[PDB]
Design an enzyme around this catalytic site. Sequence first.
Site, mmCIF file in Angstrom:
data_model
loop_
_atom_site.group_PDB
_atom_site.id
_atom_site.type_symbol
_atom_site.label_atom_id
_atom_site.label_comp_id
_atom_site.label_asym_id
_atom_site.label_seq_id
_atom_site.Cartn_x
_atom_site.Cartn_y
_atom_site.Cartn_z
ATOM 1 C CG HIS A 232 -29.170 0.883 47.014
ATOM 2 N ND1 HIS A 232 -28.570 2.102 47.243
ATOM 3 C CD2 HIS A 232 -30.002 0.670 48.062
ATOM 4 C CE1 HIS A 232 -29.030 2.612 48.373
ATOM 5 N NE2 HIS A 232 -29.905 1.765 48.887
ATOM 6 C CG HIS B 47 -29.514 -3.342 50.170
ATOM 7 N ND1 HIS B 47 -29.582 -3.130 51.534
ATOM 8 C CD2 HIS B 47 -30.598 -2.728 49.638
ATOM 9 C CE1 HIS B 47 -30.650 -2.400 51.807
ATOM 10 N NE2 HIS B 47 -31.287 -2.150 50.675
ATOM 11 C CG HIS C 192 -36.392 -3.152 49.642
ATOM 12 N ND1 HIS C 192 -35.562 -4.190 50.018
ATOM 13 C CD2 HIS C 192 -35.705 -2.009 49.887
ATOM 14 C CE1 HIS C 192 -34.414 -3.695 50.456
ATOM 15 N NE2 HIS C 192 -34.480 -2.374 50.394
ATOM 16 C CG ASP C 193 -33.508 -0.908 47.420
ATOM 17 O OD1 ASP C 193 -34.277 0.052 47.206
ATOM 18 O OD2 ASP C 193 -32.746 -0.959 48.425
ATOM 19 C CG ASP D 107 -34.263 -0.470 53.360
ATOM 20 O OD1 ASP D 107 -33.312 -0.917 52.675
ATOM 21 O OD2 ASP D 107 -34.943 0.506 52.990
ATOM 22 C CD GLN E 27 -22.327 5.722 57.934
ATOM 23 O OE1 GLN E 27 -23.041 6.393 57.190
ATOM 24 N NE2 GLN E 27 -22.474 4.407 58.073
HETATM 25 C C1 LIG Z 1 -21.131 5.675 54.556
HETATM 26 C C2 LIG Z 1 -21.207 6.939 53.751
HETATM 27 C C3 LIG Z 1 -22.285 7.887 54.126
HETATM 28 O O1 LIG Z 1 -23.552 7.339 54.249
HETATM 29 C C4 LIG Z 1 -24.681 8.163 54.644
HETATM 30 C C5 LIG Z 1 -24.564 9.569 54.705
HETATM 31 C C6 LIG Z 1 -25.699 10.341 55.094
HETATM 32 C C7 LIG Z 1 -26.877 9.722 55.416
HETATM 33 S S1 LIG Z 1 -28.314 10.707 55.899
HETATM 34 O O2 LIG Z 1 -29.085 10.112 57.013
HETATM 35 O O3 LIG Z 1 -27.829 12.087 56.272
HETATM 36 N N1 LIG Z 1 -29.253 10.720 54.523
HETATM 37 C C8 LIG Z 1 -28.703 11.089 53.246
HETATM 38 C C9 LIG Z 1 -29.757 11.394 52.235
HETATM 39 N N2 LIG Z 1 -30.711 10.329 52.131
HETATM 40 C C10 LIG Z 1 -30.737 9.446 51.047
HETATM 41 C C11 LIG Z 1 -31.233 9.851 53.386
HETATM 42 C C12 LIG Z 1 -30.171 9.621 54.416
HETATM 43 C C13 LIG Z 1 -26.990 8.353 55.348
HETATM 44 C C14 LIG Z 1 -25.843 7.573 54.939
HETATM 45 C C15 LIG Z 1 -25.998 6.027 54.916
HETATM 46 N N3 LIG Z 1 -27.042 5.480 54.298
HETATM 47 C C16 LIG Z 1 -27.206 4.154 54.303
HETATM 48 C C17 LIG Z 1 -28.415 3.531 53.555
HETATM 49 C C18 LIG Z 1 -28.241 3.493 52.072
HETATM 50 C C19 LIG Z 1 -26.277 3.355 54.964
HETATM 51 C C20 LIG Z 1 -25.200 3.960 55.609
HETATM 52 O O4 LIG Z 1 -24.273 3.225 56.267
HETATM 53 N N4 LIG Z 1 -25.102 5.294 55.570
HETATM 54 MG MG LIG Z 2 -34.612 1.789 48.255
HETATM 55 ZN ZN LIG Z 3 -32.976 -0.791 50.567
#
Ligand SMILES: CCCOc1ccc(S(=O)(=O)N2CCN(C)CC2)cc1-c1nc(CC)cc(=O)[nH]1
Ligand SMILES: [Mg+2]
Ligand SMILES: [Zn+2]
Length: 297
Positions: free
Chosen positions: A80, A84, A120-121, A220, A254
């Site tokens: 972040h 990004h 936004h971040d 995003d 993922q």
């Molecule tokens: C790659 C390492 C693990 O990465 C994740 C693990 C869990 C989940 S989740 O849908 O279960 N969940 C967790 C709690 N929240 C914040 C909402 C979403 C999302 C990611 C993830 N996020 C982003 C955006 C920042 C990008 C990305 O590639 N992967």
């Molecule tokens: Mg954000």
């Molecule tokens: Zn973002």
Amino acid sequence: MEETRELQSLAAAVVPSAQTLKITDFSFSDFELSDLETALCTIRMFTDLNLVQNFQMKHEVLCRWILSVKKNYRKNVAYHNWRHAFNTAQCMFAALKAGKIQNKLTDLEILALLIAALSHDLDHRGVNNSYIQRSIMEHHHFDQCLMILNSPGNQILSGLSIEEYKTTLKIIKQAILATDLALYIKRRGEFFELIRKNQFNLEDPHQKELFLAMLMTACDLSAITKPWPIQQRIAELVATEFFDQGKNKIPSMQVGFIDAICLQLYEALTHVSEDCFPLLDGCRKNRQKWQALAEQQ
Ligand SMILES: CCCOc1ccc(S(=O)(=O)N2CCN(C)CC2)cc1-c1nc(CC)cc(=O)[nH]1
Ligand SMILES: [Mg+2]
Ligand SMILES: [Zn+2]
């Protein structure tokens, strides 16, 4: 100052075409770009969306604004950070041009979306950082956005009439607020339900606003749509921020992220605009890649 130097160099540089900078490609990557180069790309985004023209932006002011935005992200935060934000804006630009979304929106909506994407971040401290001043994070991001937009020499909205300005600021605010995933989850049902019945219509104010929200989330999250070698690298960044900051479960997470959050959104988006298909295609290819890794534990 390094920054006074940075502004001069940026302000004096020639800005290459959108084609040269690859910013129209859904598969765009910033890994090989210097900070200065991402700043040039951002100028080109404002330029080719006719925003510099229609809203009478002075060059040094837009330059100063881009550099302020970049400076108000934190480098020490693995994912972040400015890159990004920059990528989110590039995806917005790509969806507007290549995805042909530009024709469906007003100039003020497009201006707001690009500013929101970049902003936004702002001042994010990383997913594992949370303080108590009491969509809380997103209000803080918008606050930073507004602060930069009102700072001396950074006022890129100065050319708008007060009415345009208030309309734009409210779109920017909703757009940044929309990047809260809890908010997206709460609102997407209506969007999907609407697409399902061919009832989705952009002329309705309420649906327009809903679509801008969905579009923000799509940009995003758009790293999830990148070519596999790129997505793998970005996942590495988010993993670092998720666990390191401050059996390998990542592939499974993922796949879950893609299923729960990403696929339907990109599916919905392609229905609105068939030309956004590469985002959906890219997301599907990554699910396949992560799933196979997951199957090997
Ligand atoms: C790659 C390492 C693990 O990465 C994740 C693990 C869990 C989940 S989740 O849908 O279960 N969940 C967790 C709690 N929240 C914040 C909402 C979403 C999302 C990611 C993830 N996020 C982003 C955006 C920042 C990008 C990305 O590639 N992967
Ligand atoms: Mg954000
Ligand atoms: Zn973002």
